[PDB]
Structure formats: structure tokens, C-alpha cells
Short mmCIF file of C-alpha atoms and ligand atoms in Angstrom, two decimals:
data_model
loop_
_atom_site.label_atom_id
_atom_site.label_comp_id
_atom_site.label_asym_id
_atom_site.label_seq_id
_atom_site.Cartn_x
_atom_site.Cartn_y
_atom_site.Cartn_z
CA UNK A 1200 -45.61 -8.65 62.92
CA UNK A 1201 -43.75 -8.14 65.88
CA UNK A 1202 -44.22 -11.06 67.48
CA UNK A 1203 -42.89 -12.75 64.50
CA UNK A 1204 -39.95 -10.81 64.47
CA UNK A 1205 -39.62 -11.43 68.67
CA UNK A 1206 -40.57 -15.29 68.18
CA UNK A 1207 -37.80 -15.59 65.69
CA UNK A 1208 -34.59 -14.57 68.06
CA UNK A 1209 -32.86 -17.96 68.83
CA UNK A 1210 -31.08 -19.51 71.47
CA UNK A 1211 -27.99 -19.12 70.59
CA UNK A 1212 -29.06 -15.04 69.29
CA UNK A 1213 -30.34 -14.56 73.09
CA UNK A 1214 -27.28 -16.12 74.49
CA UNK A 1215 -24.98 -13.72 72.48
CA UNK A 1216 -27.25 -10.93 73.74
CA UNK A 1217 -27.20 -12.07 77.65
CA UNK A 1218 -23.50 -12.47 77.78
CA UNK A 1219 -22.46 -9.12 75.93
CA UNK A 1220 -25.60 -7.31 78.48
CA UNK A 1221 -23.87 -8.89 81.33
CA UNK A 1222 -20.86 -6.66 80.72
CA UNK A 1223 -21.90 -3.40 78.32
CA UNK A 1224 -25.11 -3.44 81.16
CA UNK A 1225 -23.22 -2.94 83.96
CA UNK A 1226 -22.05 0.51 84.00
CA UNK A 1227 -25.59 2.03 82.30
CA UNK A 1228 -24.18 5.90 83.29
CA UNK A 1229 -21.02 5.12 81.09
CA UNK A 1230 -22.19 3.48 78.39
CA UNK A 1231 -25.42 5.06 78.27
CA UNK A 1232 -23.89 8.04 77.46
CA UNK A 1233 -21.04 6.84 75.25
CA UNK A 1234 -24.00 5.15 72.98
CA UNK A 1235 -25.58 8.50 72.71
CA UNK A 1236 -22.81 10.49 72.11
CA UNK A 1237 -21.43 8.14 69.81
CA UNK A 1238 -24.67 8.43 67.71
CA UNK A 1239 -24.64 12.45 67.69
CA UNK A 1240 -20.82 12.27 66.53
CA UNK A 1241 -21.77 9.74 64.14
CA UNK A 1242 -25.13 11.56 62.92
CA UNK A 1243 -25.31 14.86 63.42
CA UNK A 1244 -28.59 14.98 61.56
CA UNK A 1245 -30.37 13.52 65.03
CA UNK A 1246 -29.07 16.43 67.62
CA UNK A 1247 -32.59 18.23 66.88
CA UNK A 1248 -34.64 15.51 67.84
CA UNK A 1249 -33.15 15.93 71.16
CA UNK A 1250 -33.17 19.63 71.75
CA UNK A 1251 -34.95 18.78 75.01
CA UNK A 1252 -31.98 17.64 76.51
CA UNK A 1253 -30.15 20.98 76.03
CA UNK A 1254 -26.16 21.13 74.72
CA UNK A 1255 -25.32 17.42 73.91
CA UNK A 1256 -21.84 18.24 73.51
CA UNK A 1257 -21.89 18.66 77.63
CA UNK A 1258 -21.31 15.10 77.58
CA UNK A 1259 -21.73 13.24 81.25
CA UNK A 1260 -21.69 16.67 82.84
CA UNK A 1261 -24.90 17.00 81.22
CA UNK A 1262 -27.80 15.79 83.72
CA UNK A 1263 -31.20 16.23 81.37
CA UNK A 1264 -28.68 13.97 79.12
CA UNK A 1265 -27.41 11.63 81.66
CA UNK A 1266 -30.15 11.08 83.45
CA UNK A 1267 -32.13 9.98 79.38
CA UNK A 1268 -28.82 8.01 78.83
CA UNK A 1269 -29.48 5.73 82.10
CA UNK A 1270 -33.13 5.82 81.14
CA UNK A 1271 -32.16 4.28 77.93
CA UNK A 1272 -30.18 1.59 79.53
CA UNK A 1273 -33.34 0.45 81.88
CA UNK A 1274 -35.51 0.31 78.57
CA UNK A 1275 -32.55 -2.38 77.27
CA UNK A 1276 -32.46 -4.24 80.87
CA UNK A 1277 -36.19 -4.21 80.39
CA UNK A 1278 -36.09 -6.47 76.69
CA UNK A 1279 -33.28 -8.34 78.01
CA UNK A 1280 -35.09 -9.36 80.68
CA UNK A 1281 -38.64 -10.52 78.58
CA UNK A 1282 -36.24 -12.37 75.84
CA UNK A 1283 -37.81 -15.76 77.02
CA UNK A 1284 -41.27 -15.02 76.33
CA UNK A 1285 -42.37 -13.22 73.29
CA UNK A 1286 -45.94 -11.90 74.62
CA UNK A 1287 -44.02 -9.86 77.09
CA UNK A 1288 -41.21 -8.63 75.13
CA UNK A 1289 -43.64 -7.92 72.86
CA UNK A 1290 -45.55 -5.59 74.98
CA UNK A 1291 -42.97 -3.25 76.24
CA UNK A 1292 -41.17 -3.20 73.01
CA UNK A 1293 -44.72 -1.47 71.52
CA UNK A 1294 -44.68 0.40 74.62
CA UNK A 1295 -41.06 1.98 73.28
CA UNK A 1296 -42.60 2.12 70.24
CA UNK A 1297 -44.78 4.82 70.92
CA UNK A 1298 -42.52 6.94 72.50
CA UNK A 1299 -40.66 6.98 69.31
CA UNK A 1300 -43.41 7.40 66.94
CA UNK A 1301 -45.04 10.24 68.82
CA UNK A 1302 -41.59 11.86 67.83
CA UNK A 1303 -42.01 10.72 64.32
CA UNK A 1304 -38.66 8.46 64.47
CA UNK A 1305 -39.19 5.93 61.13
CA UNK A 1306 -37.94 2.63 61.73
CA UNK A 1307 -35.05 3.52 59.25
CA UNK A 1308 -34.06 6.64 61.57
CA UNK A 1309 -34.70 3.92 64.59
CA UNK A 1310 -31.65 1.54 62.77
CA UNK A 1311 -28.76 4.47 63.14
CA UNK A 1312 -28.58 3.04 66.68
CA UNK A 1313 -26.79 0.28 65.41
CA UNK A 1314 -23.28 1.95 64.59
CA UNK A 1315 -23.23 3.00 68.17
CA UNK A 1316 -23.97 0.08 69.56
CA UNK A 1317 -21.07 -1.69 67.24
CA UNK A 1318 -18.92 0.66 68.39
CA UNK A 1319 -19.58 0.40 72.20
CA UNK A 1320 -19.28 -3.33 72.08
CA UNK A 1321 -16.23 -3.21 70.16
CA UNK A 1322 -14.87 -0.95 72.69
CA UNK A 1323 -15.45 -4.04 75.33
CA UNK A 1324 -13.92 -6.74 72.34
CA UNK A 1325 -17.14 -8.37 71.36
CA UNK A 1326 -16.71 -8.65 67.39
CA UNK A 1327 -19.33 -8.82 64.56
CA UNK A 1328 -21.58 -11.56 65.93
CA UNK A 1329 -22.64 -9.53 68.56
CA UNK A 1330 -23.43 -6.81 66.76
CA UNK A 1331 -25.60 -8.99 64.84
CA UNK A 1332 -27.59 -10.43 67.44
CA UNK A 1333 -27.87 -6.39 68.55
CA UNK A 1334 -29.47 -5.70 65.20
CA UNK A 1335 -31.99 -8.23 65.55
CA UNK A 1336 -32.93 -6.93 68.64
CA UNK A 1337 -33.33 -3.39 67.38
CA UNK A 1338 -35.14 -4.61 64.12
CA UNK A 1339 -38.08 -6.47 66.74
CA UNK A 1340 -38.47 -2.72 67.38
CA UNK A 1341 -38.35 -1.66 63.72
CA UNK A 1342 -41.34 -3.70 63.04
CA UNK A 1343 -43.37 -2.06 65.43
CA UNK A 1344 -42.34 1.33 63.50
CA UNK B 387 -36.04 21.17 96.35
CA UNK B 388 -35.41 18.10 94.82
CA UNK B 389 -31.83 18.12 96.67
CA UNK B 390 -33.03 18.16 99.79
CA UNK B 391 -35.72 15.86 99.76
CA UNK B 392 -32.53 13.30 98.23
CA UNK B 393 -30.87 14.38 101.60
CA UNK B 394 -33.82 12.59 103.54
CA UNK B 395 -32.51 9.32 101.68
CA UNK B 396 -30.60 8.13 105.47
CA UNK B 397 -28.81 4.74 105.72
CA UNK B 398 -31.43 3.50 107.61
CA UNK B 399 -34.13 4.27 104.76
CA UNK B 400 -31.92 3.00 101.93
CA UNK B 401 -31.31 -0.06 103.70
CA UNK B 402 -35.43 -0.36 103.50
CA UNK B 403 -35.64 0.60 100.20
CA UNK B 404 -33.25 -2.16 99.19
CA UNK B 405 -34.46 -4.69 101.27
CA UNK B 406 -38.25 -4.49 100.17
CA UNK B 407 -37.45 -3.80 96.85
CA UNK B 408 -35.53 -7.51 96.56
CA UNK B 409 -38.91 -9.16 97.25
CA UNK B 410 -41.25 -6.80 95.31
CA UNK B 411 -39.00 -6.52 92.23
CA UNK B 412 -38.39 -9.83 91.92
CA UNK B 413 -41.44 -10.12 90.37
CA UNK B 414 -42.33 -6.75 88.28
CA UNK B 415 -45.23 -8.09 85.97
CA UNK B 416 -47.21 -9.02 88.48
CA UNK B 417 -46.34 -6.41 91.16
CA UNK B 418 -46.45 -3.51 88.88
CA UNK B 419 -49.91 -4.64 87.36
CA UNK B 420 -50.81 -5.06 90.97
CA UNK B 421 -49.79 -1.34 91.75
CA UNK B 422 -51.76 0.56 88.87
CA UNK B 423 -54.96 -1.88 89.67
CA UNK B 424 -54.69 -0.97 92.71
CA UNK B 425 -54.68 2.82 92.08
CA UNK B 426 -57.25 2.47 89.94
CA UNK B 427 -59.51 0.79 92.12
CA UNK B 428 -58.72 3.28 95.26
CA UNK B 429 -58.08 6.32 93.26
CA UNK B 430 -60.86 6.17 90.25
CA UNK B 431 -60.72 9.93 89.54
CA UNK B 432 -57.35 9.07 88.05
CA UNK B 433 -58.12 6.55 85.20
CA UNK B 434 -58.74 9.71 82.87
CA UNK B 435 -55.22 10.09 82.74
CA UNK B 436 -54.73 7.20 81.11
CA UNK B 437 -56.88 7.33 78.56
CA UNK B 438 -54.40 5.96 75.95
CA UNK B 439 -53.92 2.34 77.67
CA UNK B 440 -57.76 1.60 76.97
CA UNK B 441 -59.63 -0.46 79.21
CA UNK B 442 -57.80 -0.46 82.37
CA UNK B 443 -60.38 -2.71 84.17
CA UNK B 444 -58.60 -5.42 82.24
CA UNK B 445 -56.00 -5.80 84.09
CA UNK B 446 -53.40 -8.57 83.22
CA UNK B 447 -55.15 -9.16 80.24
CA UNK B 448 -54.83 -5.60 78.54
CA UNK B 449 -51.51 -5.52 76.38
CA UNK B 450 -50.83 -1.81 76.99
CA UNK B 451 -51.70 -1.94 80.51
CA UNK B 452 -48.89 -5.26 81.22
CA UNK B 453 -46.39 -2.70 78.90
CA UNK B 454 -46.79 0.55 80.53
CA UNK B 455 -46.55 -1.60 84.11
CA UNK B 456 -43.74 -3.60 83.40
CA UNK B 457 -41.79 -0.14 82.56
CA UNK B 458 -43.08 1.21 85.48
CA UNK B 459 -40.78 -1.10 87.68
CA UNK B 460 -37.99 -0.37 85.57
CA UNK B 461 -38.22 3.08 86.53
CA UNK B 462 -38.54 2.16 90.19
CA UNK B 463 -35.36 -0.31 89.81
CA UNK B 464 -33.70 2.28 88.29
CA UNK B 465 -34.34 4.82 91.16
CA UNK B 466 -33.15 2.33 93.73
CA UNK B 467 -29.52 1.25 91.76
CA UNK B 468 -29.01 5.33 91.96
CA UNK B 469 -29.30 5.57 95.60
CA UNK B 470 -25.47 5.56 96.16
CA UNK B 471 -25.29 8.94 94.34
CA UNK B 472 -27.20 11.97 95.23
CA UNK B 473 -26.23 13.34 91.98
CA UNK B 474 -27.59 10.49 89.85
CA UNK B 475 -30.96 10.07 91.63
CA UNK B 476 -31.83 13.71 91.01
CA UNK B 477 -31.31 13.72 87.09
CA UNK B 478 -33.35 10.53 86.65
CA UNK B 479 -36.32 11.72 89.05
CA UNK B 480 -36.37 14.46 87.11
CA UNK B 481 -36.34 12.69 83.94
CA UNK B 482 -39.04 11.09 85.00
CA UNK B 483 -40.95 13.90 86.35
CA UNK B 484 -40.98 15.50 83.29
CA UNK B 485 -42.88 12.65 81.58
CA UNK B 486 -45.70 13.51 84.14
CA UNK B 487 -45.64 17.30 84.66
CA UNK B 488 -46.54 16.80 80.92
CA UNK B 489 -49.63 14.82 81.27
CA UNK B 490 -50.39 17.65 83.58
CA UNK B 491 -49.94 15.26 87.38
CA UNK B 492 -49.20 17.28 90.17
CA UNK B 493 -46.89 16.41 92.91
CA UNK B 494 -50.61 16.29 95.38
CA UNK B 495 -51.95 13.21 92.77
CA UNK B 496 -48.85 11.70 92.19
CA UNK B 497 -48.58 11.07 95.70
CA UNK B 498 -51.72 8.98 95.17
CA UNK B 499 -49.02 6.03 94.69
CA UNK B 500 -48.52 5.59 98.09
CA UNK B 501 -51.66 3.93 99.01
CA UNK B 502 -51.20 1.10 96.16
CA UNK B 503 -47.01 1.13 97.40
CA UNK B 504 -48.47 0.33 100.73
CA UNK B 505 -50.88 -2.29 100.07
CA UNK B 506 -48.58 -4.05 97.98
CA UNK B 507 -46.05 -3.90 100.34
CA UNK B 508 -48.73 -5.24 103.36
CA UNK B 509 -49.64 -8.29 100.97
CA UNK B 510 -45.82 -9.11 101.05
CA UNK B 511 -45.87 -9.18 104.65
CA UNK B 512 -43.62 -5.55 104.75
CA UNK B 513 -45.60 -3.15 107.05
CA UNK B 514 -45.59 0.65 108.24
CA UNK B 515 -41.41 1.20 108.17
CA UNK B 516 -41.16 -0.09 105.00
CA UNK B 517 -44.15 1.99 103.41
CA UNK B 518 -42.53 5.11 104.91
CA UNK B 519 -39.62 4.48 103.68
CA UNK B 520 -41.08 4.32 100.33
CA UNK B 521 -43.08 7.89 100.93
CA UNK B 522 -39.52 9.27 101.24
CA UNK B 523 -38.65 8.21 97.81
CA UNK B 524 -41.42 9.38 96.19
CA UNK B 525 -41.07 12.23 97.65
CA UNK B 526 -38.51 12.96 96.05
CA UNK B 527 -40.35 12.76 92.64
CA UNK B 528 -42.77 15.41 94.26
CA UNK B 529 -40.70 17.49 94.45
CA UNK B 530 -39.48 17.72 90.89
CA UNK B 531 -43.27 18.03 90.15
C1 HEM C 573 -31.58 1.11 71.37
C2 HEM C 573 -32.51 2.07 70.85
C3 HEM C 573 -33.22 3.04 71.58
C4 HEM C 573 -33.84 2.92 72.79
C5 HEM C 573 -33.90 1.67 73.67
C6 HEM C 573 -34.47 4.20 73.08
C7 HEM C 573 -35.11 4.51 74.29
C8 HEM C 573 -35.67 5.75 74.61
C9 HEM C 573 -36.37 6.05 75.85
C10 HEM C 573 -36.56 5.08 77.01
C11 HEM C 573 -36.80 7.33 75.74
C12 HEM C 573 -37.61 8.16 76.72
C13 HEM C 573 -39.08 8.17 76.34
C14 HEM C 573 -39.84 9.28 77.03
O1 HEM C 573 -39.66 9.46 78.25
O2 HEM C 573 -40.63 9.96 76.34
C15 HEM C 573 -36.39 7.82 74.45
C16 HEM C 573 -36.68 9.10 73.96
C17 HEM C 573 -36.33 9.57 72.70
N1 HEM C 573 -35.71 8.82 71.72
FE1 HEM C 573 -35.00 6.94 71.86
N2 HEM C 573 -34.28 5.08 72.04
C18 HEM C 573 -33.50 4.40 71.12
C19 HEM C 573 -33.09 4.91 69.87
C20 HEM C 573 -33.41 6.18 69.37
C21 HEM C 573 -32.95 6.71 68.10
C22 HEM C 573 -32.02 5.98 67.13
C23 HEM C 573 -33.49 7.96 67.96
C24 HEM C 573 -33.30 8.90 66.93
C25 HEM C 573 -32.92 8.64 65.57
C26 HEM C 573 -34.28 8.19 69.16
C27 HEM C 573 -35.00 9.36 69.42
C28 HEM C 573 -35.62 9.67 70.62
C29 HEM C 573 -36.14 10.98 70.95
C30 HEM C 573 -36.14 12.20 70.04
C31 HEM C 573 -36.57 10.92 72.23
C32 HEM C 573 -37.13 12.07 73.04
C33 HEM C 573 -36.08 12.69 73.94
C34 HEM C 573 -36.66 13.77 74.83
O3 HEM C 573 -37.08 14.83 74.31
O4 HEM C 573 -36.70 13.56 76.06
N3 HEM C 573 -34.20 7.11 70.02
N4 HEM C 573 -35.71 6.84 73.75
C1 HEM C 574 -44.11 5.07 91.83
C2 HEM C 574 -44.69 6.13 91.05
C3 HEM C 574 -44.70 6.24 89.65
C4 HEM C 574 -43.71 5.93 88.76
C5 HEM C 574 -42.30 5.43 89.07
C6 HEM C 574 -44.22 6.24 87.43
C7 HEM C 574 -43.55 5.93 86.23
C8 HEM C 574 -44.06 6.15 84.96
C9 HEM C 574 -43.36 5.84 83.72
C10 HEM C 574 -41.95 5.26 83.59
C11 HEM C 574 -44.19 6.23 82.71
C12 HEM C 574 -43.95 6.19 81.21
C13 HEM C 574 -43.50 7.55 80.70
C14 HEM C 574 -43.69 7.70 79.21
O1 HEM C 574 -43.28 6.79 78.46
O2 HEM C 574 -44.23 8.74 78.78
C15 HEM C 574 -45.39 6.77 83.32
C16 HEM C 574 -46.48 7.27 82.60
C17 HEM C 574 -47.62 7.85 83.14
N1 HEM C 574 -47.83 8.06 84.50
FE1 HEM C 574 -46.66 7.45 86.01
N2 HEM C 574 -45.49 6.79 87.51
C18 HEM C 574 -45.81 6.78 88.87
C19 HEM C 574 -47.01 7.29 89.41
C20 HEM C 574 -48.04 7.92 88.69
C21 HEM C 574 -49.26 8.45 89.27
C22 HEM C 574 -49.63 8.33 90.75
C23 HEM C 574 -50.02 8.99 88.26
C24 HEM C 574 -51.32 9.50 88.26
C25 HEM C 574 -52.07 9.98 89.40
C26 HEM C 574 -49.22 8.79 87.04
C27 HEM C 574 -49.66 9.15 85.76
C28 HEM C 574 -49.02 8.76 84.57
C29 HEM C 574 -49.58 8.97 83.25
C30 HEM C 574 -50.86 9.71 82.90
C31 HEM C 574 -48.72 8.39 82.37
C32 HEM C 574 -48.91 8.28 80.87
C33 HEM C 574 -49.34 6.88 80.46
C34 HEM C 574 -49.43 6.72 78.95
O3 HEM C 574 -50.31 7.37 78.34
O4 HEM C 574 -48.62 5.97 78.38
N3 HEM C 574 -48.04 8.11 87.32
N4 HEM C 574 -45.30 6.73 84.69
#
């Protein structure tokens, strides 16, 4: 379940997770949008899901894209902030969920986040562990997809 | 216009944003619970809209209620970090104004907030000047609506 999956992150996963937030979390316009254009550059396949947001390749000068990209950023603060207790990280991370599913985003489509987000926290030095704990992050939300 | 209603944003206001919002955000389960119960209870002809979170009479003890809350504040946080630029605080009030001009809330209902904001506010020992202040940033959501 996802609680299982939430329950499981350790100590030392949420400490890995706090310290990298601290700095990839503190410019949320910048690397907001870097994560998402990172993933269209990466997968091209996704631009359609986002046709909302208009031309992509606009970049930051793009505001229906920056102002998703900073949205993004606040639903990450958000799990960040509930890592210490389950029920509640649970909750808003099935809250996310459904704003995914309604777009019919599988959990496997969910997972191509995770190149970006090895790539943005390589771009700030933090190596393969991090990623990790990233991954286990993103797969609490996989379960609830 | 969504520009000029930004404009109203003053140093004086700001500072009242950012001064209530350090007490009330410090604690965004229980505040933002407190601010849909609240609208619920003043405003009932608006619980149709949220059909989706179930029984909202629950309170703290319904799941997708505590979720949808919880984000709520996030969204609020978020507006308040952009208050430095004009430019930033339009494209994420828009952003989220889109999520309600598609469950159909006009700017008129949406304004229904500021009852709850001020009550909430009052119970924190923050009066009139500080519930005005937050009319002038939801305003600014009404009119992106
Ligand atoms: C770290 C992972 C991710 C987070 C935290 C996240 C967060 C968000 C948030 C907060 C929204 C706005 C919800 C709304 O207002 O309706 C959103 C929308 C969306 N997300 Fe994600 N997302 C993530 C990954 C992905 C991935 C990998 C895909 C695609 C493969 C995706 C596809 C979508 C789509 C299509 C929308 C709708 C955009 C629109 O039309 O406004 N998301 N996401
Ligand atoms: C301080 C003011 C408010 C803020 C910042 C706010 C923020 C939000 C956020 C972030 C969401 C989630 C968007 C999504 O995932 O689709 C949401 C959903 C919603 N809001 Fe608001 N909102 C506010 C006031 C109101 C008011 C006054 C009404 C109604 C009179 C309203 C009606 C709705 C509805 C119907 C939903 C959909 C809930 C669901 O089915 O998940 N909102 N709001």
C-alpha cells in the first residue's frame, strides 16, 4: 500500500532527502523549470500531456509553464515537509495522485521524472545516493498509481 | 486585470501578509482544515462543489479532506514567497485560477474565503488590518476568475 511504501523511507533516506531539498528547494522558479524542461528534452513522448501549458520550448519566458513549474516545487515542499509522519504524507501524496490519474499518467509514465531529477541534482554535485533516496520518494507515489 | 489588482500589493500590505502568515502557516494542517470547516459551516451552499472529498462534516478525520487542506496552504505559501515579483504572483494566481474556473467557481463565490480567512485570523488574535490585507490578495485570484 502506500503507507507501506511511506512507512518504509528511513532515517538516514529522509536525511539524504532534507539536505539535497535544502539546496535544489531553494530557487523553485529555476529548478522547477529546469526539471521540466529537462524531462521534455529527455522524453519528448510527454510534451502532449502538457499542451495546456502552450509552447514548452518558451522555457522560463513561458508563464502558464512557469507558474506549473513553481507549482510543482510547492507539491515537493509539501512531502518534504510530512516525511515524519506517514498518515500525512500519505494523504497529500493520494491527493497528487489524482491529479495524475485523472490525466491517465501510469505509475511507469510517473517514474520518467527520475532522469530529471538525477540530472538537476547532479547539476548541484549530489551523486547517486541522492538520486536514490529521490526514487523512493517518487515510487511512494507510484504505489498510489 | 489581474495586473492591477497585483499593483494594490503596497509595502504596507505585504508587510501584513508576511507577518500573519508566520503565525497561521506555521501550522497548515490544522489551520487549513480550520479554513474549509469553516466555509463549510458559514457558506453550506458550497459543499456541492466538493463532492469528490466525501463527507466533509468529518473534518480532521476525513483523509481527503486533511489532503486537499494541507495543499491548500501550500498554495497560499506559495502566493506569499512570490510577493517580491509582480511577474511571478500573476502566473501562479492564474495557475491556480484555472483549477477553479474549471469546477465552474466564480470570482463572487470564491470570495466566500474571506469570511473563514477572517475568523481564523480573529482566533489568532490578528484583527480587521490583517483580514483586509488578506481581501487584497485574494483579490487578486478574483480577478483571474
Ligand atoms: C516529481 C513528480 C511530479 C510532481 C510532484 C507533479 C506535480 C504536479 C502538480 C502539482 C500538477 C498540477 C495539478 C493540477 O493543478 O491539476 C501537475 C499536473 C500535471 N502533471 Fe505532474 N507531477 C510530477 C510528475 C509528472 C510526470 C512524470 C508527468 C508525465 C509523464 C506528469 C504529468 C502531469 C500533467 C499532464 C499535468 C497536467 C498539466 C496541466 O494541464 O495543467 N507529472 N503535476
Ligand atoms: C484562499 C482561497 C483558496 C485557495 C488558495 C484555493 C486553493 C485550491 C487548491 C490548491 C486546490 C486543488 C486544485 C486541484 O488539484 O485541482 C483547490 C481545489 C478546489 N477549490 Fe479551492 N481554493 C481557495 C478557495 C476556494 C473557494 C472559496 C471555493 C469554493 C466556493 C473553492 C473551490 C474548490 C473546488 C471545488 C476544488 C476542487 C476540490 C477537489 O475536488 O479536489 N476554492 N483549491
Amino acid at each position: 500500500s502506500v503507507y507501506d511504501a511511506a512507512a518504509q523511507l528511513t532515517a538516514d533516506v529522509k536525511k539524504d532527502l532534507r539536505d539535497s531539498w535544502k539546496v535544489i528547494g531553494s530557487d523553485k522558479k529555476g529548478n522547477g523549470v529546469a526539471l521540466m524542461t529537462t524531462l521534455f528534452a529527455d522524453n519528448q513522448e510527454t510534451i502532449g500531456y502538457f499542451k495546456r501549458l502552450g509552447d514548452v520550448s518558451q522555457g522560463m519566458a513561458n508563464d502558464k509553464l512557469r507558474g506549473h513549474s513553481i507549482g510543482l516545487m510547492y507539491a515537493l515542499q509539501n512531502f518534504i515537509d510530512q516525511l515524519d509522519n506517514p498518515d500525512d504524507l500519505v494523504c497529500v501524496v493520494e491527493k497528487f495522485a489524482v491529479n495524475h490519474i485523472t490525466r491517465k499518467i501510469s505509475a511507469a509514465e510517473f517514474g520518467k521524472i527520475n532522469g530529471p531529477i538525477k540530472k538537476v541534482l547532479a547539476s548541484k554535485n549530489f551523486g547517486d545516493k541522492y538520486a536514490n533516496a529521490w526514487a523512493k520518494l517518487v515510487a511512494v507515489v507510484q504505489a498510489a498509481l
